[PDB]
């Protein structure tokens, strides 16, 4: 008295205000567990702030300070915190702090492991089948509950775009996925077809497609995607 | 006498030995009508040399030239001197000489008129709908007996050459021209095919082509000449 200064080292975290003073908060962000007398703060990584175990006269009008806990340098990572909160379902990496304090920043890029879910342009699958390269779009692991970005492929495969509204469905891997066209030239749909509806000598089987687009595989007796204009057929003779 | 010298006129014809003497001809071509003690010269178009009334006396053997008739510059054309013969079935421009005296040579040449037969690669031809330009190769009229000569586009029209031994029956005009292959790259069949064969549930026709050559026309449906490698096909898809 009056004032003081306790050079707050890195491993600061908990102490006791002196005479049951009424402390306050004024710094950079909000990450307090203030009691009313002593205190206890939660994962103050990168937190520049201070508090004065104050005093105030009710009757008269003045307010002083008996102990200042000052700070000017960052706090590196410390005890058991989490560097990754959530947002809707994206795993933005915790920028300025820890749990429930997590200020947002960048998304978490991909390093390695073994995946268990993947989502893209408005659809989600589970295994390599049908996709040009696995991983893609964005994915996650079995342990967690939010996605990790990695790639940013264009919802497009030469004229064919994977939106989420209109028109003809088709199955990549194992899941129904919508698709929306663009041009009108030759173009291989990357999505295996929906329903094979049919109807020895001259036998034919056929599906449903868009304009001038072919879907794998080619017919046997012709070796040329028997396109047509709206239906890619599949012939078979005796 | 002795040894005259009758420079026969440019309009010479009938012959007249004197006091009985079997003639002897020593000319360029072979165009002398020998009729006893009197010759007759029919069409000597550009012919020189000499011809002499030689006599034979059985006592001594002093052959005596009494009447020698001579021509000093080539003879012109006059009356019934046909200068247009043939060989088997091939006309040739009779260089020098007329009736039964066609020392043939260079070929005839076209210039117009009114035709009704043309010939090319092992098969005779009639109507214009087909070969790239009517007429072509060699042709004749209705009055003559043999063909002329005007053009010579080789019997090779895009990959395929046309010859005489099989192996596929394809038609042009109203004829029936044989044809054989030669390479693999995509080429257009220049002869409408012969027999159509079929095989509603899935109606379709098929004939025979070769490797990658297409018999016109394309089905409006798949709007591209289909093929297998050994056949070309035709649907009716209502």
């Amino acid at each position: 008295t009056n004032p003081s200064t306790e050079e707050m080292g890195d491993d600061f975290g908990f102490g006791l205000c002196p005479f049951d003073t009424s402390p306050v908060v004024k710094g950079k962000y909000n990450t307090t567990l203030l009691n009313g007398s002593a205190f206890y703060l939660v994962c103050p990584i990168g937190w520049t702030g201070v508090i004065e175990c104050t005093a105030v006269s009710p009757t008269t009008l003045r307010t002083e300070v008996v102990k200042t806990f000052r700070r000017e340098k960052p706090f590196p990572h410390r005890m058991d915190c989490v560097t990754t909160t959530v947002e809707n379902e994206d795993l933005f990496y915790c920028k300025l702090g820890g749990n429930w304090t997590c200020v947002k920043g960048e998304p978490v890029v991909y390093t390695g492991g073994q995946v268990k879910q993947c989502k893209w342009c408005g659809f989600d699958f589970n295994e390599p089948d049908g996709l040009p390269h696995y991983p893609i779009g964005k994915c996650i692991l079995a342990n967690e509950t939010g996605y990790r970005i990695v790639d940013s492929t264009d919802c497009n495969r030469d004229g064919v775009v994977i939106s989420a509204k209109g028109s003809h469905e088709c199955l990549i891997g194992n899941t129904t996925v919508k698709v929306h066209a663009s041009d009108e030239r030759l173009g291989p749909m990357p999505c295996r077809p929906k329903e094979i509806v049919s109807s020895t000598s001259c036998t034919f089987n056929y599906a449903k497609t868009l304009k001038n687009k072919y879907y794998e595989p080619r017919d046997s007796y012709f070796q040329q995607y028997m396109l047509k204009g709206e239906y890619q057929y599949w012939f078979d003779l005796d």
Side-chain angles (χ1 to χ4, degrees), chain A residues 1 3-5 7-10 12-18 20 22-25 27-28 30-39 42-50 53-61 63 65-66 68 70-71 73-78 81-86 89-91 94 96-103 105 107-113 118-122 125 127-128 130-139 141-148 150-153 155-157 159-160 162-164 166-167 170 172-173 175-177 179 181-183 186-193 195-196 198-200 202-214 216-237:
Chain A
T1 175
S4 290
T5 286
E7 231 66 30
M8 287 209 288
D10 267 6
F12 187 78
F14 161 72
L16 212 84
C17 262
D20 205 89
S22 324
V24 294
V25 152
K28 162 182 276 190
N30 158 45
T31 166
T32 80
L33 315 168
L34 201 62
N35 253 305
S37 81
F39 74 131
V42 50
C43 303
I45 309 105
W47 200 71
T48 73
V50 48
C53 310
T54 44
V56 196
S57 189
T59 172
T60 49
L61 295 318
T63 166
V65 47
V66 317
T68 284
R70 200 167 255 257
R71 185 65 193 201
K73 47 189 183 63
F75 291 87
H77 55 80
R78 303 178 342 174
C81 307
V82 305
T83 40
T84 85
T85 167
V86 293
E89 224 160 351
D90 313 348
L91 287 191
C94 283
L96 326 174
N99 325 327
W100 89 277
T101 72
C102 191
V103 200
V108 292
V109 309
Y110 191 115
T111 55
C118 285
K119 186 171 274 204
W120 182 27
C121 293
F125 333 108
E127 58 217 60
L131 289 183
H133 66 280
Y134 206 37
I136 198 184
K138 41 186 180 188
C139 299
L141 294 321
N143 67 337
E144 294 163 25
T145 181
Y147 285 150
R148 302 168 178 257
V150 46
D151 203 316
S152 176
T153 59
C155 312
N156 174 76
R157 311 275 74 167
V160 52
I162 37 175
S163 277
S167 315
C170 39
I172 328 174
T175 88
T176 288
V177 166
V179 84
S182 324
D183 67 65
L186 222 63
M189 307 277 207
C191 63
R192 103 162 80 100
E195 206 186 17
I196 286 297
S198 293
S199 184
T200 42
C202 50
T203 77
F204 74 130
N205 306 320
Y206 81 102
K208 189 153 187 179
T209 177
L210 275 49
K211 275 67 178 194
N212 310 346
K213 302 292 189 171
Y214 54 118
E216 306 281 353
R218 301 129 170 272
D219 195 315
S220 73
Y221 195 71
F222 277 59
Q223 213 94 320
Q224 170 181 321
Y225 316 84
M226 304 149 315
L227 301 133
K228 193 229 62 60
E230 268 284 0
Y231 303 78
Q232 163 174 9
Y233 290 56
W234 261 278
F235 275 130
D236 167 62
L237 306 315

